[PDB]
A paper describes a structure:
Because the DISP1* protein appears as two bands on an SDS–PAGE and the loop region 253–292 is invisible in the cryo-EM map, we speculated that the recombinant DISP1* was cleaved by Furin, which is consistent with a previous study showing that Furin-mediated cleavage is required for DISP1 maturation and localization. The ECDs of PTCH1 and NPC1 twist together to create an intermolecular tunnel for cholesterol transport; in contrast, ECD-I of DISP1* is shifted from ECD-II by more than 15 Å, which is not observed in either NPC1 or PTCH1, leading to an open conformation of the two ECDs in DISP1*. On the other hand, the loop between residues 253–292, which is absent in both PTCH1 and NPC1, is disordered in the map, indicating that the flexibility of this large loop permits it to be accessible to Furin and the cleavage by Furin may release this internal loop to facilitate the endosomal trafficking of DISP1. An internal C2 symmetry is found in the TMs of DISP1*. We tentatively assign these molecules as cholesteryl hemisuccinate (CHS) based on the density shapes and the hydrophobic environment that is created by potential binding residues. There are two novel sterol-binding sites in DISP1*: One is located in the pocket created by TMs 7-10 (site 3) in a position that is symmetrically related to the sterol in the SSD.
DISP1 is a well-studied isoform that contains 1,524 amino acid residues, including a ∼170-residue N-terminal intracellular domain (NTD), 12 transmembrane helices (TMs), two extracellular domains (ECDs), and a ∼300-residue C-terminal intracellular domain (CTD). As a member of the resistance–nodulation–division (RND) transporters, DISP1 shares a similar topology with PTCH1, NPC1, and bacterial efflux transporters such as AcrB. TMs 2-6 of DISP1 form the sterol-sensing domain (SSD), which is widely conserved among polytopic membrane proteins involved in cholesterol metabolism and transport (e.g., PTCH1 and NPC1).
Numbering used by the authors: 179 to 252, 295 to 305, 313 to 338, 348 to 389, 415 to 441, 447 to 476, 485 to 662, 688 to 770, ...
């Protein structure tokens, strides 16, 4: 009644009140929001509300505070630039041919200084300024000085001033051969220092295919490159509209479904920012468009043919009955498909990183509201179509009709002449792929990152430099493990907003009792010093536990305070004299006393220590390191008294928790995606053999995805989480619509049922598969890795999933398939 009546009664009014909602949403969507910034590409990737993040951001909060006077009132520069994008020495003309280039339009003189560092450097012999090709002296000096000494480092004086180190600091280090190709690309520039001005010269004097660069414009050039990034999807959306127009035989419908998708995205953005107060907006929210123009148009293809399939079968009776029947059937199928997809992102939200959460919410609301709009624009497409050179058009129409029937008769014949074969070949592929690509070496975590990921394609300069400079700055440091007791580590800030961290909170219950708890810290420090894994070969620190300096200062000064006798009784004023003793600087943290707008005595007892292991940018060892130290500190704080009960562990390991949060977040997202997948598959089709069939198909297709995906050197960094979520969403998206379509077959046979059911499902889905495939494939040519990544991903997923779901379900339904309602429960 309600739907169909409202549809048939006033279509222009529902059109009006809808478009009203869209235009007002757009207006407010421009008025209120305070300019979503794209300055930092990876803005706010610090995982929040996850111990380490909390404990880190507390000690990080400690850094930005300390707002007082004293608390005792009483050359080849690393920052310069370089090209370096492969080291040979036939630089007879090349070196200064690189020099006389676009590095002089804006001088910006620093440290005109002759800034070659290879060319003028090699020419240290004579001439003083210019690039000079003195062949015999060049070769003889180069070959000699290259073969003099490399590895064994004021006992040997053959060089000029400071030569050797500087020589071996520009050119590639892999020259330890003791022995003697052309690309016109090497390591030279060492120009004026990097920053923003370097952007200005780059943008103005590059992007003409002119020796690739590194001078830290990645984070700004990315933001500017969003123009030609924005360009490509415009071609993607018009072409998907065009091919949709080719199929459904009505230009109006297809324009309206397209405008519906874009309206659905902007109404999602309004509903996102206005109600779900999230001031942050990362870049992946843009890639939402690309994922939404593939699956957003899908539902439409399941509608038009349904409307067409009834108006032929049912006899021109009246509009209301036809729209009612088509709507109830198409709506079940459209809700299940869209919700199953949306649920992935909505579940993915349970992850505890900032950007993925934000992206998930936005795309989630986008896919869900898209369904509402699709159902509410059904009336429009159908009823407007009711009240609606040409020779070539009619030939095309004949071709289109003929080809659809050609398809309709062939595909069932081919999929049934499969004859138990496609089952074997594809099952063997999946189990084989999966069982190898989920045990042995196949993937890793984003180790070579340091919060500097691949934000562009490998063909472009800035990424490729990673591989180039792999030929340096990395020093084997020890983990400054620092338990502090100074402040209650509680995150009093909005978890979603990355720009507001919070403020420190003092612990009034924490009071170093002057007569007590000193012997505790001593026995604790002794207990540590006796425990292993404590690197203590160096002895010239003098600030290790803070008690030693105390023991020295109570030992001295007695031979102002002027009251020191035996061990600590009154205290306070002696601690203050010891503060003076320390102050007589290296004052930042590094020492335990009161800071951060404090006029009174001790409130922070910031203790320092050294480590066992080295700073790697990978998992494994760091986790075992963390676990062991946390488990030890958790014991020693269990031995602690009432006066000091609160302490925790922290060091410089932001990267470790990023990896841990990503790994957990993906797992729990995957877990809920498979859970809702099974649940909703049960909701649509009431038999269970079909439900197992489904989940096996889901398992197979996903194991194709993250096996084929990774083999393309694609470890799980940041996006790969939400991709895996898409993969589960779109796998079941196909499976479901196959399912009910089988269940509702007129005959009680196992082959005629297949043929009919198959020919149906194929005709909806293959077109919708093609729709997505083109929408994804067209995005492959671009610069930013984000778009390339998601575009080529979802392309592969659809390309697999459709034909996967197709041939599995039907080859499985051929022989092993269900009979007279075997397994259905009321
Ligand atoms: C999903 C597809 C359709 C791409 C998304 C389209 C737009 C929502 C984005 C893409 C490019 C973005 C623009 C990229 C560059 C800038 C310049 C920016 O200016 C500054 O950075 C401040 C001054 C300066 O540094 O130059 C103001 C926002 C703006 C217009 C951005 C606003 C939002 C835009 C238009
Ligand atoms: C349309 C009909 C005839 C079915 C055929 C499907 C193909 C068109 C699909 C199946 C596998 C897909 C390929 C799977 C893997 C890749 C590798 C990938 O190559 C890269 O490594 C580029 C990424 C990078 O190095 O930056 C680019 C897309 C491509 C060729 C895909 C493009 C589309 C392909 C060829
Ligand atoms: C949809 C599915 C297929 C996605 C799976 C992708 C990742 C979430 C997987 C692939 C690699 C897995 C990691 C491979 C290796 C390990 C080491 C493992 O270490 C131990 O076994 C501890 C004991 C020891 O060996 O010392 C802990 C889990 C972890 C991080 C795994 C966690 C889950 C990861 C990140
Ligand atoms: C529906 C089925 C029957 C046809 C469509 C399946 C394809 C979408 C899949 C099947 C196997 C996949 C391929 C498996 C292996 C590779 C090789 C891989 O590249 C390499 O391993 C480089 C070679 C080397 O390592 O020496 C790139 C992805 C690719 C082409 C995969 C891309 C997608 C493919 C072609
Ligand atoms: C077109 C391809 C892509 C298939 C995609 C699925 C839907 C379009 C199919 C699945 C089940 C089909 C329905 C199966 C049964 C019927 C009952 C039929 O009404 C009758 O009961 C008439 C029986 C008779 O007198 O023969 C009207 C069409 C309808 C809704 C079918 C319309 C098309 C549906 C919804
Ligand atoms: C607290 C404690 O047990 N300290 C002992 C110390 O008495 C002993 O002199 C030393 C010999 O190496 O070993 C330490 O661990």
């Amino acid at each position: 009644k309600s739907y169909a009546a409202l549809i048939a009664d006033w279509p222009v009014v529902v059109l009006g009140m809808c478009t009203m909602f869209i235009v007002v949403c757009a207006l407010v969507g421009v008025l209120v929001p305070e300019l979503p910034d794209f300055s930092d590409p990876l803005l706010g990737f610090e995982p929040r509300g996850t111990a380490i993040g909390q404990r880190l951001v507390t000690w990080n909060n400690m850094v930005k505070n300390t707002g007082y006077k004293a608390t005792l009132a009483n050359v080849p520069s690393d920052r310069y630039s370089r090209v370096v994008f492969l080291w040979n020495l036939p630089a007879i003309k090349s070196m200064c041919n690189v020099d006389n280039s676009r590095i002089r339009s804006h001088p910006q003189f620093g440290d005109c200084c002759p800034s070659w560092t290879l060319g003028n450097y090699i020419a240290i012999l004579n001439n003083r300024s210019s690039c000079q090709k003195i062949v015999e002296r060049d070769v003889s000096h180069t070959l000699k000085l290259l073969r003099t000494c490399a590895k064994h480092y004021p006992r040997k004086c053959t060089k000029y001033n400071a030569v050797y180190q500087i020589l071996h600091y520009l050119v590639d280090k892999d020259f330890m051969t003791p022995k003697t190709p052309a690309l016109k690309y090497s390591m030279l520039f060492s120009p004026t220092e990097k920053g923003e001005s370097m952007m200005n010269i780059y943008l103005d004097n590059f992007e003409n295919w002119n020796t690739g660069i590194e001078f830290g414009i990645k984070h700004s050039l990315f933001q500017d490159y969003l123009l030609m990034d924005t360009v490509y999807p415009a071609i993607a959306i018009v072409i998907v509209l065009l091919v949709m127009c080719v199929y459904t035989k009505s230009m109006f419908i297809t324009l309206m479904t397209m405008f519906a998708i874009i309206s659905s995205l902007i109404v999602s953005y309004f509903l996102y920012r206005v109600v779900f107060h999230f001031e942050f907006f990362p870049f992946m929210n843009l890639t939402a468009l690309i994922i939404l123009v593939g699956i957003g148009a899908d539902d439409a293809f399941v509608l038009c043919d349904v409307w067409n399939y009834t108006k032929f079968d049912k006899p021109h009776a009246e509009t209301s009955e036809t729209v009612s029947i088509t709507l109830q059937h198409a709506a079940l199928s459209m809700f299940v498909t869209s919700f199953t997809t949306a649920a992935a992102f909505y579940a993915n939200y349970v992850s505890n990183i900032t950007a993925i959460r934000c992206f998930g919410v936005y795309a989630g609301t986008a896919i869900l509201v898209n369904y509402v709009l699709m159902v509410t624009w059904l009336p429009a497409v159908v009823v407007l179509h009711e009240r609606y050179c040409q020779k070539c058009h009619k030939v095309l129409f004949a071709i289109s009709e003929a080809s659809r029937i050609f398809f309709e008769k062939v595909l069932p014949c081919i999929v049934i002449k499969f004859r138990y074969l496609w089952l074997f070949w594809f099952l063997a592929l999946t189990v084989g792929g999966a069982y190898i690509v989920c045990i042995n070496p196949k993937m890793k975590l984003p180790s070579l990152e340091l919060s500097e990921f691949q934000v562009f394609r490998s063909s472009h300069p800035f990424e490729r430099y990673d591989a180039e400079y792999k030929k340096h700055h990395g020093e084997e440091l020890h983990m400054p493990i620092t338990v502090i007791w100074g402040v209650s580590p509680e995150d009093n800030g909005n978890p979603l907003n990355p720009k507001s961290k919070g403020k420190l909170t003092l612990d009034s219950s924490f009071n170093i009792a002057s007569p007590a708890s000193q012997a505790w810290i001593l026995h604790f420090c002794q207990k540590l010093r006796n425990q292993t894994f404590f690197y203590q070969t160096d002895e010239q620190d003098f600030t290790s536990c803070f008690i030693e300096t105390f023991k020295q200062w109570m030992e001295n000064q007695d031979c102002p305070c002027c009251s020191h006798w035996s061990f600590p009784y009154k205290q306070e004023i002696f601690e203050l004299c010891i503060k003076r003793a320390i102050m007589e600087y290296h004052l930042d943290s590094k020492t335990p006393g009161p800071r951060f707008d404090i006029n009174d005595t001790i409130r922070a007892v910031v203790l320092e220590f050294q480590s066992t292991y080295l700073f790697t940018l990978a998992y494994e060892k760091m986790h075992q390191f963390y676990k062991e130290v946390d488990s030890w500190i958790s014991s020693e704080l269990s031995s602690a008294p009432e006066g000091l009960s609160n302490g925790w562990f922290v060091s410089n390991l932001e990267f470790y928790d990023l990896q841990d949060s990503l790994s957990d977040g993906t797992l729990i997202a995957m877990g809920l995606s498979v859970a809702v997948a099974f649940s909703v598959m049960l909701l649509t089709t009431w038999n269970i053999i079909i439900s197992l069939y489904a989940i096996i198909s889901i398992a197979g297709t996903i194991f194709v995805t993250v096996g084929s995906l990774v083999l393309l050197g694609w470890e799980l960094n940041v996006l790969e989480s939400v991709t895996i979520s898409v993969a589960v969403g779109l796998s079941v998206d196909f499976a479901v619509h196959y399912g009910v379509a089988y269940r509702l077959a007129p005959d009680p046979d196992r082959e005629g049922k297949v043929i009919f059911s198959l020919s149906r499902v194929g005709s909806a889905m293959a077109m919708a598969a093609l729709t997505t495939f083109v929408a994804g494939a067209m995005m492959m040519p671009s610069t930013v890795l984000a778009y390339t990544q998601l575009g080529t991903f979802m392309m592969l997923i659809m390309c697999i999933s459709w034909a996967f779901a197709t041939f599995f379900f039907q080859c499985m339904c051929r022989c092993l398939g269900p009979q007279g309602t075997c397994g259905q429960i009321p």
